Protein backbone atom coordinates (compact mmCIF):
# COMPACT_ATOMS: atom_id res chain seq x y z
CA UNK A 1 0.00 0.00 0.00
CA UNK A 2 2.53 2.57 1.27
CA UNK A 3 6.23 1.70 1.33
CA UNK A 4 6.47 2.91 4.97
CA UNK A 5 4.98 -0.24 6.50
CA UNK A 6 7.83 -2.28 5.06
CA UNK A 7 11.38 -2.43 6.26
CA UNK A 8 13.14 0.84 5.60
CA UNK A 9 15.62 0.86 2.69
CA UNK A 10 18.44 1.51 5.13
CA UNK A 11 17.53 -1.51 7.26
CA UNK A 12 16.92 -4.01 4.47
CA UNK A 13 19.28 -6.98 4.33
CA UNK A 14 22.20 -6.46 1.91
CA UNK A 15 21.78 -9.74 0.01
CA UNK A 16 24.23 -11.06 -2.56
CA UNK A 17 24.86 -10.29 -6.24
CA UNK A 18 24.98 -13.87 -7.56
CA UNK A 19 21.59 -15.31 -8.62
CA UNK A 20 19.78 -18.27 -7.12
CA UNK A 21 20.42 -21.53 -9.00
CA UNK A 22 17.30 -22.39 -11.02
CA UNK A 23 16.40 -25.77 -12.48
CA UNK A 24 16.13 -26.07 -16.25
CA UNK A 25 12.61 -27.51 -16.53
CA UNK A 26 9.33 -26.96 -14.74
CA UNK A 27 8.64 -29.98 -12.52
CA UNK A 28 5.09 -30.56 -13.84
CA UNK A 29 5.00 -29.72 -17.55
CA UNK A 30 8.63 -29.96 -18.62
CA UNK A 31 8.71 -26.41 -19.91
CA UNK A 32 11.56 -23.96 -19.54
CA UNK A 33 11.82 -22.45 -16.11
CA UNK A 34 13.05 -19.24 -17.75
CA UNK A 35 12.37 -18.91 -21.49
CA UNK A 36 9.33 -17.04 -22.82
CA UNK A 37 8.23 -18.55 -26.15
CA UNK A 38 7.59 -16.04 -28.93
CA UNK A 39 4.21 -14.39 -28.56
CA UNK A 40 3.91 -15.26 -24.85
CA UNK A 41 4.04 -12.94 -21.84
CA UNK A 42 4.82 -12.71 -18.12
CA UNK A 43 2.51 -11.87 -15.22
CA UNK A 44 3.70 -11.44 -11.62
CA UNK A 45 1.39 -11.80 -8.61
CA UNK A 46 1.62 -12.09 -4.83
CA UNK A 47 -1.27 -13.87 -3.12
CA UNK A 48 0.20 -15.13 0.16
CA UNK A 49 2.21 -18.24 0.94
CA UNK A 50 3.38 -19.01 -2.50
CA UNK A 51 3.23 -22.83 -2.77
CA UNK A 52 -0.53 -23.04 -3.24
CA UNK A 53 -0.44 -19.98 -5.48
CA UNK A 54 2.10 -21.46 -7.87
CA UNK A 55 0.01 -24.64 -8.12
CA UNK A 56 -3.13 -22.53 -8.66
CA UNK A 57 -1.53 -20.97 -11.70
CA UNK A 58 0.35 -23.84 -13.39
CA UNK A 59 -2.94 -25.79 -13.59
CA UNK A 60 -4.57 -23.15 -15.79
CA UNK A 61 -4.67 -24.07 -19.50
CA UNK A 62 -2.55 -21.52 -21.34
CA UNK A 63 0.04 -21.05 -18.61
CA UNK A 64 3.41 -22.06 -20.07
CA UNK A 65 5.36 -21.90 -16.86
CA UNK A 66 5.19 -20.89 -13.21
CA UNK A 67 7.90 -20.06 -10.71
CA UNK A 68 8.02 -19.24 -7.02
CA UNK A 69 10.09 -16.24 -5.99
CA UNK A 70 10.61 -12.99 -4.13
CA UNK A 71 9.84 -9.54 -5.45
CA UNK A 72 8.89 -5.97 -4.71
CA UNK A 73 11.37 -5.48 -1.87
CA UNK A 74 14.90 -4.13 -1.55
CA UNK A 75 17.24 -7.06 -0.96
CA UNK A 76 18.87 -8.48 -4.12
CA UNK A 77 18.84 -12.29 -4.55
CA UNK A 78 17.40 -13.11 -1.11
CA UNK A 79 17.05 -16.48 0.61
CA UNK A 80 13.86 -17.87 2.08
CA UNK A 81 15.20 -17.24 5.59
CA UNK A 82 15.90 -13.62 4.74
CA UNK A 83 12.47 -13.02 3.22
CA UNK A 84 10.82 -14.72 6.19
CA UNK A 85 12.58 -12.36 8.59
CA UNK A 86 10.60 -9.53 7.01
CA UNK A 87 13.84 -7.58 6.56
CA UNK A 88 13.94 -7.92 2.75
CA UNK A 89 10.76 -5.98 1.97
CA UNK A 90 9.91 -8.55 -0.71
CA UNK A 91 6.67 -10.45 -1.05
CA UNK A 92 6.41 -14.17 -1.71
CA UNK A 93 5.28 -14.01 -5.31
CA UNK A 94 4.83 -16.14 -8.40
CA UNK A 95 6.02 -15.49 -11.98
CA UNK A 96 3.70 -16.77 -14.72
CA UNK A 97 4.51 -17.25 -18.40
CA UNK A 98 1.23 -17.47 -20.33
CA UNK A 99 -0.07 -17.33 -23.90
CA UNK A 100 -2.49 -14.40 -24.46
CA UNK A 101 -4.00 -16.39 -27.33
CA UNK A 102 -5.24 -19.04 -24.86
CA UNK A 103 -5.56 -17.24 -21.52
CA UNK A 104 -5.85 -13.44 -21.21
CA UNK A 105 -4.56 -11.07 -18.57
CA UNK A 106 -8.15 -10.30 -17.55
CA UNK A 107 -8.70 -13.99 -16.70
CA UNK A 108 -5.47 -14.18 -14.69
CA UNK A 109 -6.82 -11.16 -12.81
CA UNK A 110 -10.09 -12.97 -12.12
CA UNK A 111 -8.09 -15.89 -10.71
CA UNK A 112 -6.08 -13.45 -8.59
CA UNK A 113 -9.03 -11.69 -7.02
CA UNK A 114 -10.92 -14.95 -6.48
CA UNK A 115 -8.27 -17.05 -4.77
CA UNK A 116 -6.98 -14.82 -1.95
CA UNK A 117 -8.24 -12.13 0.42
CA UNK A 118 -7.03 -8.74 -0.91
CA UNK A 119 -8.00 -6.82 2.22
CA UNK A 120 -5.92 -8.39 4.98
CA UNK A 121 -3.01 -5.96 5.07
CA UNK A 122 0.29 -7.56 6.08
CA UNK A 123 -0.94 -11.15 6.28
CA UNK A 124 -2.78 -13.72 4.18
CA UNK A 125 -4.68 -16.52 5.83
CA UNK A 126 -2.86 -17.79 8.90
CA UNK A 127 0.51 -16.43 7.68
CA UNK A 128 1.59 -13.09 9.15
CA UNK A 129 4.23 -10.76 7.74
CA UNK A 130 4.84 -8.31 4.92
CA UNK A 131 6.16 -11.18 2.81
CA UNK A 132 2.56 -12.42 2.52
CA UNK A 133 1.02 -9.16 1.31
CA UNK A 134 -1.29 -8.87 -1.69
CA UNK A 135 0.24 -7.28 -4.78
CA UNK A 136 0.02 -6.98 -8.57
CA UNK A 137 3.22 -6.14 -10.47
CA UNK A 138 2.48 -4.99 -14.04
CA UNK A 139 5.21 -5.36 -16.66
CA UNK A 140 3.42 -3.39 -19.42
CA UNK A 141 1.16 -0.32 -19.44
CA UNK A 142 -1.71 -2.51 -20.72
CA UNK A 143 -1.43 -4.72 -17.64
CA UNK A 144 -1.12 -1.67 -15.39
CA UNK A 145 -4.41 -0.31 -16.69
CA UNK A 146 -6.11 -3.72 -16.54
CA UNK A 147 -4.97 -4.44 -12.99
CA UNK A 148 -5.90 -1.05 -11.55
CA UNK A 149 -9.35 -1.14 -13.13
CA UNK A 150 -9.82 -4.63 -11.75
CA UNK A 151 -8.98 -3.37 -8.27
CA UNK A 152 -11.72 -0.77 -8.72
CA UNK A 153 -14.30 -3.32 -9.76
CA UNK A 154 -13.42 -5.84 -7.09
CA UNK A 155 -13.65 -3.29 -4.30
CA UNK A 156 -17.16 -2.56 -5.58
CA UNK A 157 -17.91 -6.29 -5.57
CA UNK A 158 -16.73 -6.49 -1.96
CA UNK A 159 -19.14 -3.72 -1.06
CA UNK A 160 -21.92 -5.61 -2.85
CA UNK A 161 -21.04 -8.68 -0.78
CA UNK A 162 -21.55 -6.33 2.21
CA UNK A 163 -17.86 -6.22 3.13
CA UNK A 164 -16.64 -2.92 4.54
CA UNK A 165 -12.92 -3.70 4.38
CA UNK A 166 -10.73 -1.70 2.01
CA UNK A 167 -8.36 -3.47 -0.38
CA UNK A 168 -4.76 -3.54 0.84
CA UNK A 169 -3.31 -4.71 -2.48
CA UNK A 170 -0.09 -3.09 -3.72
CA UNK A 171 0.15 -2.23 -7.42
CA UNK A 172 3.60 -1.11 -8.62
CA UNK A 173 5.71 -1.41 -11.74
CA UNK A 174 7.57 -4.70 -11.62
CA UNK A 175 11.11 -4.70 -10.23
CA UNK A 176 13.60 -7.62 -10.55
CA UNK A 177 11.96 -10.99 -9.82
CA UNK A 178 14.27 -13.18 -7.73
CA UNK A 179 13.64 -16.92 -8.01
CA UNK A 180 13.20 -18.93 -4.85
CA UNK A 181 15.41 -21.85 -3.87
CA UNK A 182 14.94 -25.05 -5.90
CA UNK A 183 12.99 -26.71 -3.04
CA UNK A 184 10.12 -24.28 -3.42
CA UNK A 185 9.79 -24.56 -7.19
CA UNK A 186 6.64 -26.59 -7.88
CA UNK A 187 6.57 -27.42 -4.17
CA UNK A 188 3.09 -28.92 -3.98
CA UNK A 189 3.78 -31.16 -6.97
CA UNK A 190 6.91 -32.47 -5.25
CA UNK A 191 5.07 -32.71 -1.91
CA UNK A 192 1.41 -33.38 -2.68
CA UNK A 193 0.20 -33.31 0.92
CA UNK A 194 1.70 -29.93 1.84
CA UNK A 195 0.31 -26.53 2.80
CA UNK A 196 -1.93 -24.60 0.39
CA UNK A 197 -3.72 -21.64 1.93
CA UNK A 198 -7.48 -21.38 1.77
CA UNK A 199 -8.15 -18.55 -0.65
CA UNK A 200 -10.80 -16.03 -1.43
CA UNK A 201 -13.61 -14.14 0.27
CA UNK A 202 -16.24 -15.92 -1.83
CA UNK A 203 -16.90 -13.31 -4.56
CA UNK A 204 -15.72 -13.15 -8.17
CA UNK A 205 -15.00 -10.28 -10.53
CA UNK A 206 -17.68 -10.20 -13.27
CA UNK A 207 -16.42 -9.49 -16.78
CA UNK A 208 -15.79 -6.30 -18.73
CA UNK A 209 -17.08 -3.67 -16.27
Amino acid sequence: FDKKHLVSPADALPGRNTPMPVATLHAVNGHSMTNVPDGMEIAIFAMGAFWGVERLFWQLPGVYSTAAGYTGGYTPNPTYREVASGDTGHAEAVRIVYDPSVISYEQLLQVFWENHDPAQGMRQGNDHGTQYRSAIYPLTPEQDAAARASLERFQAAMLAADDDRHITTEIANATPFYYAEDDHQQYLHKNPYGYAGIGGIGVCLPPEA
Binding site: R153, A160, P206, P207
Partner: peptide, 14 residues
Amino acid sequence: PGTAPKYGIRGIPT
Protein backbone atom coordinates in the same frame (compact mmCIF):
# COMPACT_ATOMS: atom_id res chain seq x y z
CA PRO B 1 -23.92 -11.28 -20.99
CA GLY B 2 -26.76 -8.80 -21.53
CA THR B 3 -29.16 -9.03 -18.61
CA ALA B 4 -26.58 -9.03 -15.76
CA PRO B 5 -25.51 -5.43 -16.55
CA LYS B 6 -29.13 -4.23 -16.83
CA TYR B 7 -29.42 -4.97 -13.09
CA GLY B 8 -26.06 -3.60 -12.05
CA ILE B 9 -24.73 -6.80 -10.54
CA ARG B 10 -21.28 -6.07 -9.17
CA GLY B 11 -20.05 -9.48 -8.05
CA ILE B 12 -20.56 -13.14 -8.89
CA PRO B 13 -22.37 -14.95 -7.55
CA THR B 14 -25.41 -12.68 -7.02
